[PDB]
C-alpha cells in the first residue's frame, strides 16, 4: 500500500506565502513525478506544475510559474510547493498526484485529503 | 499550450443506458504508440481518483464497467453499465510534452 | 626508430583513407558474441593467412589493368563476369542495411544539443519501463528484469521497436528517421557528384581529431572505475570453446568486411590515384594500422563492458544478453555519459562518427559508379549526372524497409546473410581464377615488370593452395553451420533461415548465370568454347 499523507488547513493572507507539503511512501520515491493539481471550489481541476525527485527538472502551466516553486527533498521524502503573493482568489484545495512508471504516465491513485487554504 | 475541451456539458443519469463522454486532442498525436490520455474521476467532496489510463486500459481497483475507445484524435468513453453510484465529474487530461491541462468537467443528473 | 619521421607520414596518410565505420562498430559485438580472447587470437590468424594476400593482390591488379571492378575479367577471364555483377548486389544490400546505422548516428548527433543529455534521463521523457537512474551511486539493488536509462533510450527514441512484435509485424515508418536519411543520402549525392577527391583538404583536417578523440575516451574507459573486469574477459585464452564451436567464420566475415577485399572497393581505389607509388608497404601499412584501430575499439567496448558489469554486479557476457549492432550506441552512450563535458564530448564523438561514416559510405559506392563506366562507355560515362542520382533512389528505396519501426529486426538480418558466405565465394572465386584460369607466373612476371621486385615465396605459395582450399573450408563451415539469431526477447522463426538463404543467393547467382550464358554465344562444341572463354581478350 502507498500512503500519500499531506499537510492540514492553513489561513490565507493578503501578501503571505504557504507551504504545502507532501509525504508519499510505499514505493521508489525518487523515480515518479509529483504532480499539484488546484481544485477550484465548484468549478473543475486545474495544473500548477510537476517536479521529479532528484533536482532534475520543474515544469509549470506557464501561468504558475512565477506564483510557486516546488523544491524536492530526498531525504525525508516529502515534497514542498512554496507559493508568492497569495491572492484571495487563490483560496482552493491543492492535492498531490504521483505520476506512474513512466511509459504510462498516469495517476495512480494515489492522492491526499486535500489542504483547502481558508 | 495544447488545449482541450469537451463537447459534452450535462448529461442524464439512466438506470443500464449508454453515457457518452467525449474530449477532442485536436492539437495533438500518438507519440509512441500508446495514447497519452487518461480519465478521473471526481466525487462531490472526493478527490479525483483514476478510472482509465492510455484510454484503452483499465486501470488498478477499476471496474470492468468502464471502457475507453478511440485513438489519435477523438477519444470516447463507455459507461453502458451505469447504476446510481456514479454520479461524478469525469475529466481528461493528455501528457504530450509539457501541456498537462485538464478539461472542463462532464458532470451527470437527471 | 630510424625512419619515423616516414613512419609517421604513411600513418598519417592511411588513417586519412583506411580507417572506416566498420572496424568501430561491427566488430566489436562480433567479438563479444563469440567471446572475449577466444577472437583476437582466429582474428588475427584469418588475417595473416587470408587478408594480407588478397589485399596486396587486389591492389596490384588495380594499379597494372587500371579499369573497373568489373572491368578486370575483360582481359583475365570473360566468362568470369558475373563477380562483377555479384559485387553490384552486394554493394546494393550493404548501402540498404549500412546506412541504418548512419541514420542512428545523425539522430543521435541532433539529440544530443540539448543541456540535459537525454541517456541520463527516464521520467516519463518517451517510453520508459523498470528505470535505474544511477547503477551504485544511490545505493539501489539491481534486480532482474530492469533496463538501463541508455537502454531504454535506444529502444524507445531512435527506433519504437515495441510497435513491432517481431519480424513477422512490420508496422510504419518512422518520419524521424526517413528526414534523417533523406538529409543524408542528399549530403552524400552532393559529394559524388563528381568523384575527384584525391589530396583533399577535408579529408586532412577531419582525419585529425578522430585520433584525439579515441585517446581520451579509451583514457576515460582506463581511469573508471570498476573497469578492470572487461580486460580479463578481453584476454583470455578460452580454449574450451574454439575446437568445433564455429568461430573462425565470424572472424572471417569481420576481416573481409574490415579490410575491403571481397567488395569492389580496393580496385576502383587502384585504378587510379596511384602508379608504382611505394607499393608492397602501404597495404601492410593499411592493414596494420587497421588492425590496431579495431584492436582499440574492442579494448574500449570491452572496457565499457566490464565497467557495467561491475556496476549492476553480474557477468560480463551477460550483460548484453543477444544484443547485436545495439552494443554500440549502449557501451558507447553510458561512457559519455559519465563524463565532465559530457554535452561537448557526445557532440564531437557523434560527428566524427558521422564523417567516419560518410567516407566509408563514399568509398563503397565508388566501387560500383566508375565500375560500370567501362563497360558503357558512351551511355553512362559522359552523363555522370542521371546515374548517380538512379542509383541513390534504388538505394534509397531498398533503405525504407529497414526504417520500419522493427527496424533492428532487420539489420541483424541482412547482417549475417547478405555480406557472410557472398563475399567469401566471391573472393574465393576470383582468387582461385586469377591463380590457376590466369596463370600465377604470369601475375609475378607483371608486378615485377611493373615494380621492380619478386614477392616472397610466402605470398606465391599462398594464392595457389593455402587461400583457395582455406576459403572452400571457410565456406563449408559457413554451409555446415546453421545459423541462430536471436534479438532482444525475440526468436527468429524457421522461414527467417530461408529468406537469409535467398538473400544469400541472388547475391551470388550471378556467375553461374554468365558461365551457362558465356557457352552460348560462342558457337562451337564445349572444348572450344571453353579455350576461348579461359583465355584472356586481346585490345
Ligand atoms: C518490468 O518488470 C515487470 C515485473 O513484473 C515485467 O512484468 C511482467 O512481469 C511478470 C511477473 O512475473 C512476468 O510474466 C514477466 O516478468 C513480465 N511479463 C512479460 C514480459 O510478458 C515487465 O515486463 C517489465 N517491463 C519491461 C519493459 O521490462
Ligand atoms: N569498409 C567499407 C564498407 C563497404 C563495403 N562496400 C560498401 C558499399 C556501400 C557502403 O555504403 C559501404 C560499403
Ligand atoms: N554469422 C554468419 C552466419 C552464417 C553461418 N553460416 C551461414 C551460411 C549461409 C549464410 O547466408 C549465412 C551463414
Ligand atoms: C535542430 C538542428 C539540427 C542540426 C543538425 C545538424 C546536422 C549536421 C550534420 C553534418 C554532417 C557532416
Ligand atoms: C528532430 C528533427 C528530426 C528531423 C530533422 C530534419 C532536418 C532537415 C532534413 C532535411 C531533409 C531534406
Ligand atoms: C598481420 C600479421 C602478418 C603481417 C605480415 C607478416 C609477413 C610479412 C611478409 C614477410
Ligand atoms: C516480412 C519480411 C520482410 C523481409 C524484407 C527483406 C528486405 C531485404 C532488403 C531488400
Ligand atoms: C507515418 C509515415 C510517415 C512517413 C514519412 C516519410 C515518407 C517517405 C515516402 C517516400
Ligand atoms: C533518374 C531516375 C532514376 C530512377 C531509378 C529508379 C530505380
Ligand atoms: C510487412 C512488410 C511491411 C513492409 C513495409 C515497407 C515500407
Ligand atoms: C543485366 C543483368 C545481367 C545479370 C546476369
Ligand atoms: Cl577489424
Redesign the interface.
Given at each position: 500500500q502507498v500512503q500519500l499523507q499531506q499537510s492540514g488547513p492553513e489561513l490565507v493572507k493578503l501578501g503571505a506565502s504557504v507551504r504545502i507539503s507532501c509525504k508519499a511512501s510505499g514505493y521508489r520515491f525518487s523515480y515518479s513525478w509529483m504532480?499539484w493539481?488546484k481544485?477550484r471550489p465548484g468549478?473543475?481541476?486545474?495544473?500548477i506544475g510537476?517536479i521529479y525527485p532528484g533536482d532534475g527538472d520543474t515544469?509549470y502551466?506557464?501561468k504558475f510559474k512565477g506564483k510557486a516553486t516546488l523544491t524536492a527533498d530526498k531525504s525525508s521524502s516529502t515534497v514542498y510547493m512554496q507559493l508568492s503573493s497569495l491572492t484571495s482568489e487563490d483560496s482552493a484545495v491543492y492535492?498531490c498526484a504521483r505520476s506512474?512508471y513512466g511509459?504510462?504516465?498516469?495517476?495512480?491513485?494515489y492522492?491526499?485529503?486535500?489542504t483547502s487554504v481558508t | 499550450?495544447i488545449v482541450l475541451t469537451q463537447s459534452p456539458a450535462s448529461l442524464a443519469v439512466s438506470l443500464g443506458q449508454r453515457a457518452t463522454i467525449s474530449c477532442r486532442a485536436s492539437e495533438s498525436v500518438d507519440?509512441?504508440?500508446?495514447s497519452?490520455l487518461?480519465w478521473?474521476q471526481?466525487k462531490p467532496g472526493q478527490?479525483?481518483?483514476?478510472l482509465i489510463?492510455?484510454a484503452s486500459?483499465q486501470?488498478?481497483?477499476v471496474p470492468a464497467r468502464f471502457s475507453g475507445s478511440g485513438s489519435g484524435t477523438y477519444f470516447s468513453l463507455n459507461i453502458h453499465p451505469m447504476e446510481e453510484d456514479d454520479t461524478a465529474?469525469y475529466?481528461c487530461?493528455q501528457?504530450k510534452g509539457?501541456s498537462?491541462?485538464?478539461?472542463?468537467?462532464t458532470k451527470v443528473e437527471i | 626508430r630510424e625512419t619515423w619521421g616516414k613512419k609517421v607520414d604513411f600513418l598519417l596518410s592511411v588513417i586519412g583513407y583506411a580507417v572506416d565505420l566498420g572496424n568501430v562498430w561491427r566488430f566489436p559485438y562480433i567479438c563479444y558474441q563469440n567471446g572475449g580472447g577466444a577472437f583476437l587470437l582466429p582474428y588475427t590468424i584469418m588475417a595473416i593467412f587470408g587478408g594480407i594476400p588478397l589485399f596486396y593482390m587486389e591492389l596490384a591488379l588495380g594499379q597494372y589493368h587500371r579499369n573497373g571492378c568489373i572491368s578486370i575479367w575483360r582481359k583475365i577471364c570473360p566468362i568470369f563476369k558475373g563477380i562483377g555483377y555479384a559485387i553490384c548486389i552486394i554493394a546494393f544490400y550493404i548501402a540498404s542495411y549500412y546506412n541504418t546505422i548512419m541514420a542512428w548516428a545523425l539522430y543521435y548527433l541532433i539529440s544530443s544539443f540539448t543541456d540535459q543529455l537525454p541517456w541520463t534521463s527516464c521520467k516519463?521523457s518517451?517510453?520508459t519501463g523498470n528505470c535505474t537512474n544511477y547503477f551504485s551511486e544511490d545505493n539501489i539493488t539491481w534486480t532482474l528484469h530492469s533496463t538501463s536509462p541508455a537502454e531504454e533510450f535506444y529502444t524507445?527514441h531512435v527506433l519504437?521497436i515495441?510497435?513491432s512484435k517481431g519480424l513477422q509485424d512490420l508496422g510504419g515508418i518512422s518520419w524521424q528517421l526517413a528526414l534523417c536519411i533523406m538529409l543524408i543520402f542528399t549530403v552524400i549525392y552532393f559529394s559524388i557528384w563528381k568523384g575527384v577527391k584525391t589530396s583533399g583538404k577535408v579529408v586532412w583536417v577531419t582525419a585529425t581529431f578522430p585520433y584525439i578523440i579515441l585517446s581520451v575516451l579509451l583514457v576515460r574507459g582506463a581511469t573508471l572505475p570498476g573497469a578492470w573486469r572487461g580486460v580479463l574477459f578481453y584476454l583470455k585464452p578460452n580454449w574450451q570453446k574454439l575446437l568445433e564451436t564455429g568461430v573462425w567464420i565470424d572472424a572471417a566475415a569481420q576481416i573481409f568486411f574490415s579490410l575491403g577485399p571481397g567488395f569492389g572497393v580496393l580496385l576502383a581505389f587502384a585504378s587510379y590515384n596511384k602508379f608504382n607509388n611505394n607499393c608492397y608497404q602501404d597495404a601492410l601499412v593499411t592493414s596494420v594500422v587497421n588492425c590496431m584501430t579495431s584492436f582499440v575499439s574492442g579494448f574500449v567496448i570491452f572496457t565499457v563492458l566490464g565497467y557495467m558489469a561491475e556496476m549492476r554486479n553480474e557477468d560480463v557476457s551477460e550483460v548484453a544478453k543477444d544484443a547485436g549492432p545495439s552494443l554500440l550506441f549502449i557501451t558507447y552512450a553510458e561512457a559519455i555519459a559519465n563524463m565532465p563535458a559530457s554535452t561537448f564530448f557526445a557532440i564531437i564523438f557523434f560527428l566524427m562518427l558521422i564523417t567516419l561514416g560518410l567516407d566509408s559510405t563514399f568509398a563503397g559506392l565508388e566501387g560500383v559508379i566508375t565500375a560500370v563506366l567501362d563497360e558503357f562507355p558512351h551511355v553512362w560515362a559522359k552523363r555522370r549526372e542521371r546515374f548517380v542520382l538512379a542509383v541513390v533512389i534504388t538505394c534509397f528505396f531498398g533503405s525504407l524497409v529497414t526504417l520500419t519501426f522493427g527496424g533492428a529486426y532487420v539489420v541483424k538480418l541482412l547482417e549475417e546473410y547478405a555480406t557472410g558466405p557472398a563475399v567469401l565465394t566471391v573472393a574465393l572465386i576470383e582468387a582461385v581464377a586469377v591463380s590457376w584460369f590466369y596463370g600465377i607466373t604470369q601475375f609475378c612476371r607483371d608486378v615485377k615488370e611493373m615494380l621492380g621486385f619478386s614477392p616472397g615465396w610466402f605470398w606465391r605459395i599462398c594464392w595457389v593452395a593455402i587461400s583457395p582450399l582455406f576459403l572452400l573450408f571457410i565456406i563449408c563451415s559457413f554451409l555446415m553451420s546453421p545459423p541462430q539469431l536471436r534479438l532482444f526477447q525475440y526468436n527468429y522463426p524457421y522461414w527467417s533461415i530461408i529468406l537469409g538463404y535467398c538473400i544469400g543467393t541472388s547475391s551470388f547467382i550471378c556467375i553461374p548465370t554468365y558461365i551457362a550464358y558465356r557457352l552460348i554465344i560462342t558457337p562451337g562444341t564445349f572444348k572450344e568454347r571453353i579455350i576461348k572463354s579461359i583465355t584472356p581478350e586481346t585490345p
Amino acid at each position: 500500500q502507498v500512503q500519500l499523507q499531506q499537510s492540514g488547513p492553513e489561513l490565507v493572507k493578503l501578501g503571505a506565502s504557504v507551504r504545502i507539503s507532501c509525504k508519499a511512501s510505499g514505493y521508489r520515491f525518487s523515480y515518479s513525478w509529483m504532480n499539484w493539481v488546484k481544485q477550484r471550489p465548484g468549478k473543475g481541476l486545474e495544473w500548477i506544475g510537476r517536479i521529479y525527485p532528484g533536482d532534475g527538472d520543474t515544469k509549470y502551466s506557464g501561468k504558475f510559474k512565477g506564483k510557486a516553486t516546488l523544491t524536492a527533498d530526498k531525504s525525508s521524502s516529502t515534497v514542498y510547493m512554496q507559493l508568492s503573493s497569495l491572492t484571495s482568489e487563490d483560496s482552493a484545495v491543492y492535492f498531490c498526484a504521483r505520476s506512474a512508471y513512466g511509459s504510462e504516465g498516469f495517476a495512480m491513485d494515489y492522492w491526499g485529503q486535500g489542504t483547502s487554504v481558508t | 499550450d495544447i488545449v482541450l475541451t469537451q463537447s459534452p456539458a450535462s448529461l442524464a443519469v439512466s438506470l443500464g443506458q449508454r453515457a457518452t463522454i467525449s474530449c477532442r486532442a485536436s492539437e495533438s498525436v500518438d507519440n509512441y504508440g500508446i495514447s497519452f490520455l487518461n480519465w478521473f474521476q471526481q466525487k462531490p467532496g472526493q478527490p479525483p481518483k483514476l478510472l482509465i489510463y492510455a484510454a484503452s486500459n483499465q486501470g488498478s481497483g477499476v471496474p470492468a464497467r468502464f471502457s475507453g475507445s478511440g485513438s489519435g484524435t477523438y477519444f470516447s468513453l463507455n459507461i453502458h453499465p451505469m447504476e446510481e453510484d456514479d454520479t461524478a465529474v469525469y475529466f481528461c487530461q493528455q501528457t504530450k510534452g509539457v501541456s498537462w491541462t485538464f478539461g472542463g468537467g462532464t458532470k451527470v443528473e437527471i | 626508430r630510424e625512419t619515423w619521421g616516414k613512419k609517421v607520414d604513411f600513418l598519417l596518410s592511411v588513417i586519412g583513407y583506411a580507417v572506416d565505420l566498420g572496424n568501430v562498430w561491427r566488430f566489436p559485438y562480433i567479438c563479444y558474441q563469440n567471446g572475449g580472447g577466444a577472437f583476437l587470437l582466429p582474428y588475427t590468424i584469418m588475417a595473416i593467412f587470408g587478408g594480407i594476400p588478397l589485399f596486396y593482390m587486389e591492389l596490384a591488379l588495380g594499379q597494372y589493368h587500371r579499369n573497373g571492378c568489373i572491368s578486370i575479367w575483360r582481359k583475365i577471364c570473360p566468362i568470369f563476369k558475373g563477380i562483377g555483377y555479384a559485387i553490384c548486389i552486394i554493394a546494393f544490400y550493404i548501402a540498404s542495411y549500412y546506412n541504418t546505422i548512419m541514420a542512428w548516428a545523425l539522430y543521435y548527433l541532433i539529440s544530443s544539443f540539448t543541456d540535459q543529455l537525454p541517456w541520463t534521463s527516464c521520467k516519463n521523457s518517451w517510453n520508459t519501463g523498470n528505470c535505474t537512474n544511477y547503477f551504485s551511486e544511490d545505493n539501489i539493488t539491481w534486480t532482474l528484469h530492469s533496463t538501463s536509462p541508455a537502454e531504454e533510450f535506444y529502444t524507445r527514441h531512435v527506433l519504437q521497436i515495441h510497435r513491432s512484435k517481431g519480424l513477422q509485424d512490420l508496422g510504419g515508418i518512422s518520419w524521424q528517421l526517413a528526414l534523417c536519411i533523406m538529409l543524408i543520402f542528399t549530403v552524400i549525392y552532393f559529394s559524388i557528384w563528381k568523384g575527384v577527391k584525391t589530396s583533399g583538404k577535408v579529408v586532412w583536417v577531419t582525419a585529425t581529431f578522430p585520433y584525439i578523440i579515441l585517446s581520451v575516451l579509451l583514457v576515460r574507459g582506463a581511469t573508471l572505475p570498476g573497469a578492470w573486469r572487461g580486460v580479463l574477459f578481453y584476454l583470455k585464452p578460452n580454449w574450451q570453446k574454439l575446437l568445433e564451436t564455429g568461430v573462425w567464420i565470424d572472424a572471417a566475415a569481420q576481416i573481409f568486411f574490415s579490410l575491403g577485399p571481397g567488395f569492389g572497393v580496393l580496385l576502383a581505389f587502384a585504378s587510379y590515384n596511384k602508379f608504382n607509388n611505394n607499393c608492397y608497404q602501404d597495404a601492410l601499412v593499411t592493414s596494420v594500422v587497421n588492425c590496431m584501430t579495431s584492436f582499440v575499439s574492442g579494448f574500449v567496448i570491452f572496457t565499457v563492458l566490464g565497467y557495467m558489469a561491475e556496476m549492476r554486479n553480474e557477468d560480463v557476457s551477460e550483460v548484453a544478453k543477444d544484443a547485436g549492432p545495439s552494443l554500440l550506441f549502449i557501451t558507447y552512450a553510458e561512457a559519455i555519459a559519465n563524463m565532465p563535458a559530457s554535452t561537448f564530448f557526445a557532440i564531437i564523438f557523434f560527428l566524427m562518427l558521422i564523417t567516419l561514416g560518410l567516407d566509408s559510405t563514399f568509398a563503397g559506392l565508388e566501387g560500383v559508379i566508375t565500375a560500370v563506366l567501362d563497360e558503357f562507355p558512351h551511355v553512362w560515362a559522359k552523363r555522370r549526372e542521371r546515374f548517380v542520382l538512379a542509383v541513390v533512389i534504388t538505394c534509397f528505396f531498398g533503405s525504407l524497409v529497414t526504417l520500419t519501426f522493427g527496424g533492428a529486426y532487420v539489420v541483424k538480418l541482412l547482417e549475417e546473410y547478405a555480406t557472410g558466405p557472398a563475399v567469401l565465394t566471391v573472393a574465393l572465386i576470383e582468387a582461385v581464377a586469377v591463380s590457376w584460369f590466369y596463370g600465377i607466373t604470369q601475375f609475378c612476371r607483371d608486378v615485377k615488370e611493373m615494380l621492380g621486385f619478386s614477392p616472397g615465396w610466402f605470398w606465391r605459395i599462398c594464392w595457389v593452395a593455402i587461400s583457395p582450399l582455406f576459403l572452400l573450408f571457410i565456406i563449408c563451415s559457413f554451409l555446415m553451420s546453421p545459423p541462430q539469431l536471436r534479438l532482444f526477447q525475440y526468436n527468429y522463426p524457421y522461414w527467417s533461415i530461408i529468406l537469409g538463404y535467398c538473400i544469400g543467393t541472388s547475391s551470388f547467382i550471378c556467375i553461374p548465370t554468365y558461365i551457362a550464358y558465356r557457352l552460348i554465344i560462342t558457337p562451337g562444341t564445349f572444348k572450344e568454347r571453353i579455350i576461348k572463354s579461359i583465355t584472356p581478350e586481346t585490345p
